[PDB]
Design an enzyme around this catalytic site. Sequence first.
Site, PDB file in Angstrom:
ATOM      1  N   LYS A 115       7.197   7.825   3.796  1.00  0.00           N
ATOM      2  CA  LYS A 115       6.332   6.818   3.494  1.00  0.00           C
ATOM      3  C   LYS A 115       5.313   7.434   2.721  1.00  0.00           C
ATOM      4  CE  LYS A 115       3.729   2.868   5.075  1.00  0.00           C
ATOM      5  NZ  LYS A 115       3.661   1.881   6.123  1.00  0.00           N
ATOM      6  N   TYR A 117      15.109   8.487   8.940  1.00  0.00           N
ATOM      7  CA  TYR A 117      15.792   7.534   7.904  1.00  0.00           C
ATOM      8  C   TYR A 117      16.803   6.884   8.641  1.00  0.00           C
ATOM      9  CZ  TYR A 117      18.976   6.645   4.089  1.00  0.00           C
ATOM     10  OH  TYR A 117      19.884   5.783   3.239  1.00  0.00           O
ATOM     11  N   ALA A 118      16.795   5.378   8.593  1.00  0.00           N
ATOM     12  CA  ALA A 118      17.751   4.580   9.164  1.00  0.00           C
ATOM     13  C   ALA A 118      18.821   4.149   7.846  1.00  0.00           C
ATOM     14  CB  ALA A 118      17.062   3.201   9.583  1.00  0.00           C
ATOM     15  N   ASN A 146      11.790  -5.400  10.022  1.00  0.00           N
ATOM     16  CA  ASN A 146      11.357  -3.997  10.633  1.00  0.00           C
ATOM     17  C   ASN A 146      12.014  -3.472  11.961  1.00  0.00           C
ATOM     18  OD1 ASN A 146       9.865  -5.206  12.616  1.00  0.00           O
ATOM     19  ND2 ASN A 146       7.920  -5.060  11.274  1.00  0.00           N
ATOM     20  N   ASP A 194       7.153   0.081  11.445  1.00  0.00           N
ATOM     21  CA  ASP A 194       6.314  -0.537  10.713  1.00  0.00           C
ATOM     22  C   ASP A 194       5.030  -0.893  12.080  1.00  0.00           C
ATOM     23  OD1 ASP A 194       4.683  -2.296   9.245  1.00  0.00           O
ATOM     24  OD2 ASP A 194       6.157  -3.749   9.400  1.00  0.00           O
ATOM     25  N   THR A 236       3.453 -11.897  10.375  1.00  0.00           N
ATOM     26  CA  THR A 236       4.311 -12.709   9.562  1.00  0.00           C
ATOM     27  C   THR A 236       4.536 -13.984  10.103  1.00  0.00           C
ATOM     28  OG1 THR A 236       5.619 -10.835   8.812  1.00  0.00           O
ATOM     29  CG2 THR A 236       6.621 -12.898   8.581  1.00  0.00           C
ATOM     30  N   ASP A 261       4.073  -7.309  14.845  1.00  0.00           N
ATOM     31  CA  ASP A 261       4.683  -7.914  13.874  1.00  0.00           C
ATOM     32  C   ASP A 261       6.295  -7.760  13.821  1.00  0.00           C
ATOM     33  OD1 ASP A 261       4.749  -9.209  11.250  1.00  0.00           O
ATOM     34  OD2 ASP A 261       4.149  -7.514  10.167  1.00  0.00           O
ATOM     35  N   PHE A 318       0.707  -1.002   0.031  1.00  0.00           N
ATOM     36  CA  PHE A 318      -0.049  -0.066   0.063  1.00  0.00           C
ATOM     37  C   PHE A 318       0.768   1.414   0.172  1.00  0.00           C
ATOM     38  CE2 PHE A 318      -2.821  -3.175   1.519  1.00  0.00           C
ATOM     39  CZ  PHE A 318      -4.017  -3.262   0.920  1.00  0.00           C
ATOM     40  N   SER A 319       2.416   1.119  -0.133  1.00  0.00           N
ATOM     41  CA  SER A 319       2.931   2.378  -0.022  1.00  0.00           C
ATOM     42  C   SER A 319       4.304   2.224  -0.561  1.00  0.00           C
ATOM     43  CB  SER A 319       3.120   2.746   1.415  1.00  0.00           C
ATOM     44  OG  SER A 319       3.981   1.874   2.208  1.00  0.00           O
ATOM     45  N   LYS A 324      10.041  -8.448  13.551  1.00  0.00           N
ATOM     46  CA  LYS A 324      10.780  -9.287  12.693  1.00  0.00           C
ATOM     47  C   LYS A 324      11.883  -8.548  12.180  1.00  0.00           C
ATOM     48  CE  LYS A 324       7.884  -8.150   8.947  1.00  0.00           C
ATOM     49  NZ  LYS A 324       6.832  -8.597   7.765  1.00  0.00           N
TER      50      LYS A 324
HETATM   51  C1  LIG Z   1       8.428  -4.488   3.579  1.00  0.00           C
HETATM   52  N1  LIG Z   1       8.478  -2.947   3.319  1.00  0.00           N
HETATM   53  C2  LIG Z   1       7.344  -2.272   2.769  1.00  0.00           C
HETATM   54  C3  LIG Z   1       7.691  -0.719   2.938  1.00  0.00           C
HETATM   55  C4  LIG Z   1       8.746  -0.641   4.090  1.00  0.00           C
HETATM   56  C5  LIG Z   1       9.146  -2.203   4.171  1.00  0.00           C
HETATM   57  C6  LIG Z   1       9.038  -2.512   5.674  1.00  0.00           C
HETATM   58  C7  LIG Z   1      10.318  -2.148   6.621  1.00  0.00           C
HETATM   59  N2  LIG Z   1      10.191  -0.668   6.921  1.00  0.00           N
HETATM   60  C8  LIG Z   1      11.340   0.218   6.602  1.00  0.00           C
HETATM   61  C9  LIG Z   1      10.833   1.509   6.994  1.00  0.00           C
HETATM   62  C10 LIG Z   1      11.710   2.688   7.117  1.00  0.00           C
HETATM   63  C11 LIG Z   1      13.150   2.631   6.298  1.00  0.00           C
HETATM   64  C12 LIG Z   1      13.802   2.007   5.281  1.00  0.00           C
HETATM   65  C13 LIG Z   1      15.160   1.777   5.558  1.00  0.00           C
HETATM   66  N3  LIG Z   1      15.607   1.037   4.466  1.00  0.00           N
HETATM   67  C14 LIG Z   1      14.564   0.458   3.846  1.00  0.00           C
HETATM   68  C15 LIG Z   1      14.469  -0.518   2.977  1.00  0.00           C
HETATM   69  C16 LIG Z   1      13.049  -0.659   2.367  1.00  0.00           C
HETATM   70  C17 LIG Z   1      12.042  -0.075   2.891  1.00  0.00           C
HETATM   71  C18 LIG Z   1      12.061   0.878   3.927  1.00  0.00           C
HETATM   72  C19 LIG Z   1      13.487   1.216   4.459  1.00  0.00           C
HETATM   73  C20 LIG Z   1      13.528   3.952   7.008  1.00  0.00           C
HETATM   74  O1  LIG Z   1      14.842   4.658   6.605  1.00  0.00           O
HETATM   75  N4  LIG Z   1      12.651   4.560   7.937  1.00  0.00           N
HETATM   76  C21 LIG Z   1      11.718   3.571   7.975  1.00  0.00           C
HETATM   77  O2  LIG Z   1      10.566   3.865   8.715  1.00  0.00           O
HETATM   78  C22 LIG Z   1       9.618   1.344   7.311  1.00  0.00           C
HETATM   79  C23 LIG Z   1       8.616   2.298   7.606  1.00  0.00           C
HETATM   80  C24 LIG Z   1       7.228   2.035   7.753  1.00  0.00           C
HETATM   81  C25 LIG Z   1       6.843   0.704   7.692  1.00  0.00           C
HETATM   82  C26 LIG Z   1       7.733  -0.317   7.188  1.00  0.00           C
HETATM   83  C27 LIG Z   1       9.151  -0.089   7.296  1.00  0.00           C
END
Ligand SMILES: CN1CCC[C@H]1CCn1cc(C2=C(c3c[nH]c4ccccc34)C(=O)NC2=O)c2ccccc21
Length: 277
Positions: A38, A88-89, A137, A150, A163, A132, A20-21, A134
């Site tokens: 996001k 941002y990570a 996230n 997440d 998951t 969730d 969804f995003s 894992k």
């Molecule tokens: C399976 N996914 C669909 C999109 C995100 C990913 C799940 C893990 N994830 C990573 C997120 C974030 C970050 C990510 C850093 N490297 C990534 C690589 C792919 C997707 C997201 C990130 C971040 O910098 N800040 C974040 O919050 C994130 C933020 C909101 C929900 C889920 C998120």
Amino acid sequence: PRKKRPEDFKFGKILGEGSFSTVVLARELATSREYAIKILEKRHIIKENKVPYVTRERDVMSRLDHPFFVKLYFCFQDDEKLYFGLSYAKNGELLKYIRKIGSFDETCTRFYTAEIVSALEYLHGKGIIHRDLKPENILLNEDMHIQITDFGTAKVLSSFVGTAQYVSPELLTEKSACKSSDLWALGCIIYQLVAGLPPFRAGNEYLIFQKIIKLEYDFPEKFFPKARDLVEKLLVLDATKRLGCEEMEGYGPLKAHPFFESVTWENLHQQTPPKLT
Ligand SMILES: CN1CCC[C@H]1CCn1cc(C2=C(c3c[nH]c4ccccc34)C(=O)NC2=O)c2ccccc21
Ligand SMILES: *SCCCC(=O)N1CCN(c2cccc(Cl)c2)CC1
């Protein structure tokens, strides 16, 4: 101050895409600050009845203010989309490191487990259940400290099944997660860090569930003895009997486990993380 607008940012590389995003690395131009934004497509979420997922996400993240969590800094919107401005990570997902390194040594497993325990203590104290948790996230920032994300699927104490690898028996069979469900996930994660693979493995989701409900899993020969014990005290069918849960008198006895013998809990987030194995 006015709400931010897309024009305020230079949108860069796509970090990842979910159902969804899209999460996109972006630089706020006026201040040169980097954010993970996001981006949510309104129509797709409208049409899929997922909106609650969206408000819970915004709501929960807005109340997170602890070093081991992603923070929500702003939200704006247009006709098409909803934009969440997030921490941002830079170093991406814990998962990436499990894949890359294979499995963590005892020092690394102990350090990262301790940060996860400390984060869950904070979250549970706020009456929030992750639901969730894992390696996907649990993110790593530039200093290699964790930042958990997440939260759209979280439960706030005021039908979902996470998951398959990390889902708790009570969520499967009772349709209800509790704080302790995250400690079950922690058990799975500790196991994965040490073994290189999660404990309940099988050819499909149905078969994984079966193993979960019967507590059917084994320890490989490489498994650190203290980690073996800790996992056995986390992977317990009865959610009120997991080390660290409220009915077992909370985080104290969990943090006292000898698996954490050499850890300094006090300002963990300020300590230099051990280089990954
Ligand atoms: C399976 N996914 C669909 C999109 C995100 C990913 C799940 C893990 N994830 C990573 C997120 C974030 C970050 C990510 C850093 N490297 C990534 C690589 C792919 C997707 C997201 C990130 C971040 O910098 N800040 C974040 O919050 C994130 C933020 C909101 C929900 C889920 C998120
Ligand atoms: S950026 C401020 C967000 C405020 C908020 O919580 N909203 C705004 C409207 N929302 C919405 C509209 C259309 C489609 C979806 Cl999926 C959500 C979410 C609630």
